Structures are given as structure tokens and as C-alpha cells.
């Protein structure tokens, strides 16, 4: 496993726009489009992102590429943020794949908030980061996901993921 095929997991694949768990219209490997209500906001956004006229439909190949960009931003995001780069490097590769989990859930200036699990998770206080980390809206409102990336960082396997 790795950061594609767990995400693949987390987020599915549909070709088609659809609304993400927060009602907002997203398309393939969960690429967000906007957060306006607007479907016609997004067909903008989603014939600028490929660059083609798309009417609301994508190919698997055009939503693997958006996933390669995004899950790019994701990393580049995680290096270039003062707070987050830190515990990211003191990590082991698994954790660091549900770091990048959770950045392309929720975003880094999202994530760098999480001050205090950052900090357990710098210290490898592994059983005391999952706790504190299920403390939170993105554990209520999505808590299925969020038990398997917190097992990862608790455990740093993969144990969550196997068997999908
Ligand atoms: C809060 C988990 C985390 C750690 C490092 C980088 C990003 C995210």
C-alpha cells in the first residue's frame, strides 16, 4: 500500500460530478471543484481543470491525473508549511501517508491547527495522538475514515487498510 491506493480507498472513484460528505461538488478521486452551490460554478471549474469541454464527465485517465496533482499539492503543501514540516520529516513513511490523508482531506492551513496532536505526533506519543486526535469535527463527521488514518498513525501499518 501507499498514498494512491489508500486514498483510492478513502475517496472511491466517480466520474461524474457529485456532492463530497460536505455537500460540495467534487469529481474523481475526491477532487474538490468548489464550494459554491452553483453546478454551473463547477462545470467552469471542471472544464478549467481539464481543459476540455466537459459537461460534468471526466475519464478514469483525467481523474488519475487530477489525483497525481492533488495528492502533489498535498505533499509540496505539507513541506512549505513551517508547522506541519517538522512533524511530517520525523515521521516513518506510513505515518507520513496519513498525514498526507488528512491534508488532502481538510487542507494544510486545516491540519496545521491541530497543534497539539502535531505535537504528540512529533514525540511519538502515538496512543496519546490518537486519542487526541478523535477529539475533533473532522472524527465526528467522518468517523469511519478518520478511525482508519488515526490506526495508521497509532500503529504505523496498515492494518486498517487491508482488506479495504
Ligand atoms: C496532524 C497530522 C499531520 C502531521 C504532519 C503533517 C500533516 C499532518
Same mark, same amino acid.
Given at each position: 500500500?501507499?498514498?494512491f491506493?489508500?486514498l483510492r480507498?478513502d475517496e472511491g472513484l466517480r466520474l461524474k460530478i457529485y456532492?463530497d /460528505?460536505?455537500?460540495y461538488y467534487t469529481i474523481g478521486i475526491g477532487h474538490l471543484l ?8 463547477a462545470?467552469?471549474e471542471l472544464?478549467?481543470a481539464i481543459?476540455?469541454?466537459c459537461?460534468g464527465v471526466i475519464t478514469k485517465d483525467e481523474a488519475e491525473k487530477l489525483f497525481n496533482q492533488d495528492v ?32 488532502f ?36 463527521? /467522518? ?7 488515526? /490506526? ?13
Amino acid at each position: 500500500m501507499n498514498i494512491f491506493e489508500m486514498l483510492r480507498i478513502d475517496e472511491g472513484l466517480r466520474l461524474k460530478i457529485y456532492k463530497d /460528505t460536505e455537500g460540495y461538488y467534487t469529481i474523481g478521486i475526491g477532487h474538490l471543484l468548489t464550494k459554491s452551490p452553483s453546478l454551473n460554478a463547477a462545470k467552469s471549474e471542471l472544464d478549467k481543470a481539464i481543459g476540455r469541454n466537459c459537461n460534468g464527465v471526466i475519464t478514469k485517465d483525467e481523474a488519475e491525473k487530477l489525483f497525481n496533482q492533488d495528492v502533489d499539492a498535498a505533499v509540496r503543501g505539507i513541506l512549505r508549511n513551517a508547522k506541519l514540516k517538522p512533524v511530517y520529516d520525523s515521521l516513518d513513511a506510513v505515518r507520513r501517508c496519513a498525514a498526507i490523508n488528512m491534508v488532502f482531506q481538510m487542507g494544510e492551513t486545516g491540519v496545521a491547527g491541530f497543534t497539539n496532536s502535531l505535537r504528540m505526533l512529533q514525540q511519538k506519543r502515538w496512543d496519546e495522538a490518537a486519542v487526541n486526535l478523535a477529539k475533533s469535527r473532522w472524527y465526528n463527521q /467522518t468517523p469511519n475514515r478518520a478511525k482508519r488514518v488515526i /490506526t495508521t498513525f497509532r500503529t504505523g501499518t496498515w492494518d486498517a487498510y487491508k482488506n479495504l
